[PDB]
Design a protein around this ligand. Structure first.
Ligand SMILES: [Ca+2]
Length: 218
């Protein structure tokens, strides 16, 4: 549907109101193996497709903080969906965020890059930040550092929301459930492991999906 990227699952798209939205931040929470990273890799392929096939004829940028990006997985999803894998890999730009300060600087650097590429036929339409809070949690420790950590995270989310609106891109971020917090910034989706190997998504009703050779499916 209009301005949305399909997840690869019709059930998950229905729950999301058609898929992930441009000009917005979608935040997916869950433990390791819940489907969050698999969903990010599938969306990096889906965004490239025409709108009738659930994409935006776009490119993706994947920012990693905990070594989760797998080009071979994109290659596999592309091959299994009948798409050209070299084209798919050429359209997903990868950058590692080394620490929380660098992670925050990457938003302005991505903004500078998208600006110069304004005339391009295939613009970036999806920005993924996998494990959004990992560097903030490991660099701000002790009870006294919590307020500062939250303040820096809020500023980072505000910079991402501004990026989504200046370039009409979908921002997709992954995180883990927090004992304290907190959004204001988003659309929050919790992912769980289901029976057998299915995964369940819930908005913070519910939708069932699976992890296959094609990435995310029903
Ligand atoms: Ca996963």
């Amino acid at each position: 549907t209009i301005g949305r990227i399909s997840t690869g699952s019709k059930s998950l798209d229905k729950l999301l109101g058609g898929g992930i939205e441009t000009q917005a931040i979608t935040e997916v929470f869950g433990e390791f193996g819940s489907g969050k990273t698999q969903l990010a890799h599938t969306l990096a392929v889906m965004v490239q497709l025409p709108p009738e096939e659930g994409g935006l004829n776009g490119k993706a940028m994947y920012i990693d903080t905990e070594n989760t990006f797998r080009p071979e997985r994109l290659l596999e999803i592309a091959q299994n969906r009948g798409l050209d894998p070299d084209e798919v890999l050429d359209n997903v730009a990868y950058a590692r965020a080394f620490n929380s300060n660098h992670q925050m600087l990457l938003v302005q650097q991505a903004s500078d890059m998208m600006k110069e590429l304004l005339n391009t036929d295939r613009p970036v339409k999806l920005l993924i930040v996998d494990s959004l809070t990992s560097h903030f949690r490991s660099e701000y420790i002790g009870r006294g550092a919590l307020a500062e950590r939250q303040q820096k995270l809020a500023k980072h989310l505000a910079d991402l929301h501004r990026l989504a609106n200046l370039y009409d891109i979908a921002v997709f971020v992954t995180n883990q459930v927090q004992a304290n917090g907190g959004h204001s910034a988003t659309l929050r989706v919790y992912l769980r492991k289901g029976k057998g190997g299915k995964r369940i998504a819930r908005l913070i009703g519910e939708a069932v999906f699976s992890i296959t050779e094609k990435g995310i499916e029903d």
